Structures are given as C-alpha cells and as structure tokens.
Amino acid sequence: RAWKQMSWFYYQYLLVTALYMLEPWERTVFNSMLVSIVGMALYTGYVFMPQHIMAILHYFEI
Amino acid sequence: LVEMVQALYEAPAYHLILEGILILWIIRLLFSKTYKLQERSDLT
Amino acid sequence: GLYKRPFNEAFEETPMLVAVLTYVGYGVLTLFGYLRDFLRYWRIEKCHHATEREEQKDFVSLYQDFENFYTRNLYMRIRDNWNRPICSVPGARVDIMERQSHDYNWSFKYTGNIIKGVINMGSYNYLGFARNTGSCQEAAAKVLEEYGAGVCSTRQEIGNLDKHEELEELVARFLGVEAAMAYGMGFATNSMNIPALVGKGCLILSDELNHASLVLGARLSGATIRIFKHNNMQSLEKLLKDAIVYGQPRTRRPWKKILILVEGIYSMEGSIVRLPEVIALKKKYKAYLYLDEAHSIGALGPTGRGVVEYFGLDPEDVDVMMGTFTKSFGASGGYIGGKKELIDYLRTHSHSAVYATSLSPPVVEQIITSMKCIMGQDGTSLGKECVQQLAENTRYFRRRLKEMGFIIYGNEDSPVVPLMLYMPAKIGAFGREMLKRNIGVVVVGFPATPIIESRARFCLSAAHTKEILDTALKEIDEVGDLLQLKYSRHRL
Amino acid sequence: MNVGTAHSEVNPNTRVMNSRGIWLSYVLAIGLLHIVLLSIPFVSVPVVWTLTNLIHNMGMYIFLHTVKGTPFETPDQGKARLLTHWEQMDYGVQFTASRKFLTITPIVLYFLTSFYTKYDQIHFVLNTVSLMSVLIPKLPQLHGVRIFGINKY
C-alpha cells in the first residue's frame, strides 16, 4: 500500500524532472548530485544555523 | 533605514557615483518608450 | 458580420506551477544534451550514426551539427510515438505492426506479432469513407480495370481525360460555385496556385497558424507577407488599414492587390475561422479572400458543404475556395473553386497544369462516388447519417472530456480535440500508455508548438460507435489519473 | 517535432522569452543558485555573493551572446545562422519588455552584491568587469558586430 504510494510519487518525480526519458546512468548522475546537495545543505544548516527548525520538527512530532 | 544610510555613507565616492549613473541608466531604459526596429533602406 | 448561432470557444491559460515545471524539464534536457554532445565529440562514447564517406572527408560538412540538437537529444528519446506502421485499412480500428528498440530508439527491430483492433484517433477519416468494402471500392475497381492506374502525361498535353472533366463539373455543383479545378496533391494545390494569383507588388495577409503549404506558396511568389494574430479581427483590421494608408514599404505606392489567406478549421488549435467578420472586413477594405477548407469540407455544415454552409453564408463571397479530398472523402487530391474566369486563368497559368502529372482514374472515381453519396445522388439514406453521427460524437466526446477536468482547445463544434499535456516527458508517457491500452493518438511537442503547450490531438469520426467512445473515455480517465493531466480549474 | 506543424512562425527561438512564467523561472533559478552557493560550508558571505554574480553573468553571456543559430531545423533557410540569441530576440526590435528585464536584472544583482560585499575594492573591480562584460553587448549600437572577427562564423 504505502510502497505503491511511494512508487507513484517517484514516478511523478521522474515525470516532472524529465528524468523519465533519460538513460539509467543519467538518472544516476542527477540523483547523486541532488542527494549530495541536499546532504551538504543539511550539514551546513545544522552546523551554522540554530536548531530552531529542529525544535519545530520535534514539537510537531510530539 | 538609518542603518542603510550609514552603510551607504561607508561607501567610497566613485562607487556611489557609479551606482547613481547606473540608476539613471535604468530610468532611461524604463522610459525609452520608443521601440526602434534597427533597419535602414534607401531608394535606388 | 453577425452570427445566426452562438460562437463558443475556450483556450484556458496554463497554470503557473505547470509552466515552471515545464521550464525545469526543458532545462534539464538541454543540459544533458550538451553533456551528451561533449561526450560524443571526444569519442568517449561511440556514436551510433552514419558518417560521410572517407573520400569526402575534405569536403565542407553537409549539415550543421547544432541544427540537429533537438533531433539528437529530445526527438530521438521519444521517437517511437511517430511513424507507426499499419497493415490494415485506417478505419475505426486499425492493426499496428509492433516494433522494439534495444539502443534507445536509434534503430527499430520488427517483431512478428501484430497489435490488432487499436482504436483509431489519429487518422483523418471524418465521415468514415476509408473502407475496403463498399460501392466506392467497386467503382474504383471497375475504373482501375478500364483505365489502368496512373496517367503518363500532363493536362495541357495528351494527359487530359474525361474523368477529370466529370470530376471538375461535379465538384463545381457540390460547392455551389461556377467552376472548379482538380489537382493531384493538396500541398501542390497551394504551392503551385498561390504564386499564379499574386506576385511582386502585392500584399498577402496570412494568419498566425497557417499550414506549411500556404506559407510555402506565399514565399514562392514575390509578394510581401504580413502576419496577424490568430482569429484576431482587431489585428486584421489594423493591418488592412495600415497597408491601405501607408502603401508599399520603400517607395510609397498603392498596393496592386491584397490577399487574405485563412483556413476553415485549424487542425492543431481546433478553432473555426470567424468567417462573417473576415468577409465584412474584406468587403469594407476591398480585399480578396483565399479560404483553405481541407479540414471542414466534409466535417462542418448541415449537409457537409463546409464553413460557408456552417455560417449560412454565400459561396459567391469567397474569391478562392481551396480544398482537399484526403481528409473527408478518403482519397488523395485537391481542388480550387471559384468563378469561371478564375478557373480559366488557372487552367492556363498553373504550374501543376503545365508541368505536373494529373490525377489517377481510380482516385477520381472514388472521389466521385463518395461525393455523390454525400450529396444524396444515390438515393440511399447514407450521407446524412454520417454527418449527424459525426456531430453527435463530437459533442458527446468534447462534453465528456471537459467535465472530467481536462483542458481542451477550440470550438464546441470542431471534430478535432486537442488535449493539453504541457510537459516534455508527459508527451512520450501519454503516447506509450495510450498505446498500451489499445488507443492510437498523435502527440505534438515543443518546436512544432509554443514552448509551454504540448498537446495530443484526437480526431473523431462518424465511424466511431458509442461503445468505442465510452471505452476510449474510460481509458483516457485512467491515464489522466495516472499522469495527473487534469489541470482545469473551472470544472473537475 | 517539425517547425510549422502547429504554428506558422519560422523561428520560434524569438518567442521563448515572451512566454508565460519564464521570468519567474529565471528568478527562481537565480535564487536556487544562490541557495546552493550558501550551502557550501567554508565560504564567506561576500565571496558567495560575488560568486553568484560571476556565475550568473558568465552563464548569461554564454547563452545570450556566444551561442549563435538555432538548435533546430528552421524553414527560413538559415536566416539566423550567424545571429546570436540576443540578436534573434523579437526579430531585431531593440527595446522590449523582455530585453528591458534581461538588461535590468544584472544591475539589480550587482547592487545587491555590492551592498553585501561591504564595498570592497577587489570585489568592486571583479563585479564591475563582469557587469560591463554583460551590459556592453546589450547596447543597441553593438548589434551584429564582432570585435577582431571573433565568433564571426
């Protein structure tokens, strides 16, 4: 059930980012660059910016 | 606004003159209502 | 000009988020295309293409590489949605030969199996005359047996036949004009007759969405071409006023002639020309009218006579009425109708009349039989049922798709339905998904269209029964849910 | 697909900048570049802003004033075979809303990056050289002219 929903969301991501018509290695390149940028941004936000957003996420979780 | 004024005052004179002439240029583009077509023909 | 009936059309604007995502996709594709070009240039990846022969390596390169950019990087990826072969009559259901590619559409290999019973929404048979069994087929067979296939000369030479005269007089009767002429190609009609009418010193006012044949015919003649906005009477009137007032561009002189090129139904947009306004403007400003009527000569009108009958106007008001037999009548060819003097001047001074081979006898016999059936000469009830069924199918299909949440262009009467996809990947996705469910459609991408609107064209027919339409509609609804193609804000 | 299937215009490349949502996409691209530049850990704010200015200006110069022609076959027999995109824009009309926007935006970026760089002289000269390199080709007088015959063919 939830796996089907996640696969559908991945399909929509492919359709929107035009990765649907690219070859597998181009998808690999794009995905690797994207995840690298997101991880680097999270690292910078944790190190420098105060964890106020983390407090908001913890409050939402509770 | 006061802090912005102080920051502007911290700038050198040539930099502010360049920014002012750039702003005047922007005004000239905004009010350049003439849409020239860049053509020229003459009779034979 | 005034309309006897309401004139409804709708062209909904693109949602802003959809436009942003479209630009994101096009940018990604452009960047990866540049990367692939860089890889291919340095031979890091072997190029799967043909190259110039070794003896001509020192010649100037035949093509320019940049012009093939979108062909190498965008067209080739989704190349399998086009050029699909068929091995059956293009009726309501068609058989499609199946092919597969192993190198990402750079080469296609043919599997033995054949897809059968694909619902046909890509062919042009509006009135369902594309049949392998019928009266027209028997007449064509008899004429093929008698006259043979193809004539081996020109009309001005020994190549003029009696079948051609019969076809021309019957066409003149069908349209209501005094006289008409017939040619062997719809493209050639425009390309070879527009240069005859006008020349250097005349003005041609062409709509924004004219066919390539009309544009080529206008370019071949030496006339000046000015383009007005699609179905914008204000723009047409402004251009007419400026042309009459300010004269020729360099040496201000009165124009020798003014010709307005318009179409009956615009295929890709799906709209119908505002004929009363155009006629009123040309009467006021003393201009001549050229009316391309390829898509409306059989589809529109209570008796299927075209746009002039649809608006209930007078055929004598339009100077030149061109048309094509390919769309509605199910046979190749074309025609030009008008006054007798125009037809005589065309018979004397037409490129295809002097240098080109005339029509084929079986083709003209099929056209004659189909048009006699349409006008009711045979006496059978057929010929009115086709038009009525086409109208009902168009109305039902358009209403059902509009109430499903889709965005659709054009009038409510045109039998051409452009569905809107708006994104480059959804073009190929829609084509493949619809073929997977046994529906054949046509998809149009960026360089053909404006950048933000990419579409899929449905061509309805009088041969489409109600169950076929219902099946197609349910499959379209499922695919629209799958691909999120319901962008309409007004109703969903 | 083929040019002329759904529109009679010979060169669609002249309208891509007049479309809907193109300006918003341009601004969002600049913002995303700025965000991914801020994402770098060991780079200071003025350096980030001058890198944003330099990269945006370099890409803009490459796309508008370096690449010439069209990426697709066109039915006017290669009339724009030698013109760059800035020259093809709007069929040579020198002033237009799109041209005004494209000329104004680097100046606004320059103002912002001068404010955030605290008016340092090194950053001043770098950003001024970049701004001149972008703004000089936009001049109506400098239309269809290649200095020293570079990028002529």
| Three-class DSSP labels, C6-64 | CCCEECCCCCHHHHHHHHHHHHHHHHHHHHHHHHHHCCCCCCCCCCCCHHHCCCCCCCC
Q: Report which secondary-structure segment, H or E, holds D62.
A: none
Sign for the CA dihedral angle at C482, C486, C491, D5 comes to negative
Half-sphere exposure of B19 (CA within 13 A, CB side): 18
Q: Give residues 39 to 58 of A whose Cβ lies within 8 Å of D.
A: 40-41, 43-44, 47-48
The technique by which this structure was obtained is cryo-EM
D137 neighbors D63 (Cβ within 8 angstroms) = no
Q: Which chain A residues touch D43 with a CB distance below 8 Å?
A: none
Active site residue C327: yes
Rounded to the nearest 10°, the torsion over CA C415, C416, C419, C424 is 170
Q: How far is CA C254 from CA C203, C227, C247, C265, in A?
A: 10, 19, 5, 32
C-alpha B41: how far from chain center:
31
| 3 state DSSP class of C393 | helix
Q: In sequence order, which residues have a C-beta less than 8 Å from that of residue C356 and are 6 or more positions away?
A: C154, C183, C184, C188, C192
Q: Cα–Cα distance between C97 and C410 in angstroms, integer?
A: 33
Mutate to test the interface with C, among A4, A5, A9, A15 (most CBs of C within 10 A): A15
Gyration radius of chain C's alpha carbons = 24
Which residues in C345-460 belong to E strands, given as ranges?
Answer: 410-411, 416-420, 439-440, 442-444, 455-459
Q: How far is CA C446 from CA C178, C428, C432, D19, in A?
A: 43, 12, 18, 13
Q: Cα–Cα distance between D24 and D32 in angstroms, integer?
A: 12
Tokens of D101: 């926007």
Q: Cα–Cα distance between C96 and C122 in angstroms, integer?
A: 12
Q: How far is CA C262 from CA C187, C196, C275, C419, D8, in A?
A: 15, 18, 9, 24, 12
| 3 state DSSP class of C419 | strand
Tokens of D32: 């995303």
Q: What percent of the residues of chain A are helix, what percent strand, and what percent coil, each to the nearest 5? A: 85, 0, 15
Question: Are B43 and C249 a contacting pair at CB < 8 A?
Answer: no
C444 neighbors A34 (Cβ within 8 angstroms) = no
Tokens of C116: 């059968």
Residue C355 pairs in a beta bridge with none
Q: Cα–Cα distance between A15 and C34 in angstroms, integer?
A: 21
Active site residue C340: no
| 3 state DSSP class of C483 | helix
| 3 state DSSP class of C1 | coil
Which residues in B1-44 belong to E strands, given as ranges?
Answer: none
| 3 state DSSP class of C126 | coil
Of D107, D114, D128, the CB nearest to B26: D107
Question: Are C444 and D5 a contacting pair at CB < 8 A?
Answer: yes
A22 neighbors C76 (Cβ within 8 angstroms) = no
Q: How many C-beta neighbours within 10 Å does residue D137 have?
A: 16
Q: Which chain D residues touch A43 with a CB distance below 8 Å?
A: 41
Strands C288-292 and C258-263: parallel
Tokens of C167: 């076809």
Active site residue C271: no
Q: Which chain B residues touch D110 with a CB distance below 8 Å?
A: 22
Phi and psi, residue C489, nearest 5°: -95, -25
Shortest alpha-carbon distance between residue B37 and chain C (Å): 14
Phi and psi, residue D40, nearest 5°: -70, 130
| 3 state DSSP class of B43 | coil
Using CA coordinates, name the residue in chain D closest to C19: D21
Tokens of C391: 């109208």
- Alpha-helix residue ranges (DSSP H) falling in D22-61: 22-38, 45-61
Q: Cα–Cα distance between C367 and C477 in angstroms, integer?
A: 38
Half-sphere exposure of C299 (CA within 13 A, CB side): 27
Tokens of D36: 């991914």
Environment class of C267 (CB within 10 Å of its CB; exposed 0-12, middle 13-18, buried 19+): buried
- Alpha-helix residue ranges (DSSP H) falling in C198-316: 212-220, 233-246, 275-285, 307-310
Q: In what order do the strands lie in the sheet with C416-420?
A: C416-420, C455-459, C442-444
Q: Which chain C residues touch B41 with a CB distance below 8 Å?
A: 249-250
Q: Which chain A residues touch C75 with a CB distance below 8 Å?
A: none
D102 neighbors D17 (Cβ within 8 angstroms) = yes
Q: Which chain B residues touch C251 with a CB distance below 8 Å?
A: 43
DSSP state of C87: -
Structural resolution in Å: 2.9
C264 neighbors C294 (Cβ within 8 angstroms) = yes
Which single residue is written with the structure tokens 């109430």?
A: C403
Strands C416-420 and C455-459: antiparallel
CA nearest to C131, candidates C93, C187, C180: C93
Residue C259 pairs in a beta bridge with C204, C288
Phi and psi, residue D59, nearest 5°: -65, -40
CA nearest to D110, candidates B29, B28, B23, B14: B23
Q: Whats the size of chain B, residue-wise?
A: 44
Q: Return the amino acid letter for A23.
A: E
Sign for the CA dihedral angle at C368, C121, C68, D78 comes to positive
| 3 state DSSP class of C196 | helix
D65 neighbors D137 (Cβ within 8 angstroms) = yes
Q: Report which secondary-structure segment, H or E, holds C372.
A: helix C361-375
Phi and psi, residue C323, nearest 5°: -160, 170
Rounded to the nearest 10°, the torsion over CA C379, C380, C381, C387 is -90
For chain A, which chains pass the contact test of at least 3 CB pairs under 8 Å? C, D
A and C touch with 3+ CB pairs <8 Å, answer yes
D103 neighbors D44 (Cβ within 8 angstroms) = no
Question: Are D40 and A40 a contacting pair at CB < 8 A?
Answer: yes
| 3 state DSSP class of D89 | helix
Half-sphere exposure of D121 (CA within 13 A, CB side): 3
Question: Are C14 and D20 a contacting pair at CB < 8 A?
Answer: yes
| 3 state DSSP class of D142 | coil
CA nearest to D14, candidates D96, D99, D85, D100: D85
Q: How far is CA D108 from CA B30, C190, D35, D101, D105, in A?
A: 14, 52, 18, 10, 5
Q: In what order do the strands lie in the sheet with C439-440?
A: C93-100, C109-120, C439-440
Q: Cα–Cα distance between D42 and D44 in angstroms, integer?
A: 7
C451 neighbors C22 (Cβ within 8 angstroms) = yes
Q: Cα–Cα distance between D136 and D143 in angstroms, integer?
A: 10
Question: Are D36 and A41 a contacting pair at CB < 8 A?
Answer: yes
Rounded to the nearest 10°, the torsion over CA C31, A23, C24, C11 is 120
Touching check for C189 and chain D: CB below 8 Å? Answer: no
Q: Return the amino acid letter for C476.
A: I
Q: In sequence order, which residues have a C-beta less than 8 Å from that of residue C311 and are 6 or more positions away?
A: C3, C4, C275, C276
CA angle C126, C127, C129 (to 5 degrees): 110
- The DSSP result for C136-192, as a single string, is HHHHHHHHHHHH-S--SSBTTTTT--HHHHHHHHHHHHHH-SSEEEEES-HHHHHHH
